[PDB]
């Protein structure tokens, strides 16, 4: 008997909020002007430390520990960059034109050009952050979206037991759906507005997937700045 399908929506939001990982700092100081490899080393150094927090945040997501260890590895392997980007996009809502990688690392769109091929990813990230700002995304909606990515991004990429696990993931996903609608009901949106906003939120997950695939492409080509040990294992899962 799982506890994820047993929680209520208010208890669901409370659980996701409590499980939120912190916002890590960068090793950046404006006194040294970075280069292409210097900034790429910082983002690699930051994302590697976030992965450790994300892995422990994943355990506290309702339903994730109710899966096999091999399936937990698969979900994180497929979703890790999506999780990082939507976190970056969430931190950057109140900084138009800027991507707040860290409280001390607020990068401009023009500074993203310091890496060849990074500008397109930055613009998609900036457009995504602008979209959350226009929607006035709520933190209770963010934790729901982020946990949805964890359970949905690798569910169609994996036996009668393997099919029994996918049935549990869809039950948790349908629960998080209710939780989102519950949030939109408290806010006072009409029924038509709840269906529209719910569609708007989940349609953005399609873009976050696009940015992850595009970004993953260049990530396993520049390695050919040296990458981290755990970061290489996350990259080999996407070849």
């Amino acid at each position: 008997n799982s506890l994820a399908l047993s929680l209520t929506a208010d208890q669901m939001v409370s659980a996701l909020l409590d499980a939120e990982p912190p916002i890590l700092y960068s090793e950046y100081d404006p006194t040294r002007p970075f280069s292409e490899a210097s900034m790429m080393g910082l983002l690699t150094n930051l994302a590697d430390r976030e992965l450790v927090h994300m892995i422990n945040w994943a355990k506290r997501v309702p339903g994730f520990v109710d899966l096999t260890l091999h399936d937990q590895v698969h979900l994180l392997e497929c979703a890790w960059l999506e999780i990082l980007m939507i976190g970056l996009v969430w931190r950057s809502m109140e900084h138009p034109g800027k991507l707040l990688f860290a409280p001390n690392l607020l990068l401009d769109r023009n500074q993203g050009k310091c890496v060849e091929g990074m500008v397109e990813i930055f613009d998609m990230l900036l457009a995504t952050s602008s979209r959350f700002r226009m929607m006035n995304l709520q933190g209770e909606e963010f934790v729901c979206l982020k946990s949805i990515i964890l359970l949905n991004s690798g569910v169609y990429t994996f036996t009668l037991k393997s099919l029994e696990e996918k049935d549990h993931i869809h039950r948790v996903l349908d629960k998080i759906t209710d939780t989102l609608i519950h949030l939109m009901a408290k806010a006072g949106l009409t029924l038509q507005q709840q269906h529209q906003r719910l569609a708007q939120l989940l349609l953005i997950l399609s873009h976050i997937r696009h940015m992850s695939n595009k970004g993953m492409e260049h990530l396993y080509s520049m390695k050919c700045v040296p990458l981290s040990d755990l970061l290489l294992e996350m990259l080999d899962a996407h070849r």
């Binding site: 892995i55 994943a58 260890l69 937990q72 590895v73 392997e77 755990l230 294992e233 996350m234």
Partner: peptide, 10 residues
Amino acid sequence: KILHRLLQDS
């Protein structure tokens, strides 16, 4: 792997 151990650590 690293992701394997951290997921089962503690």
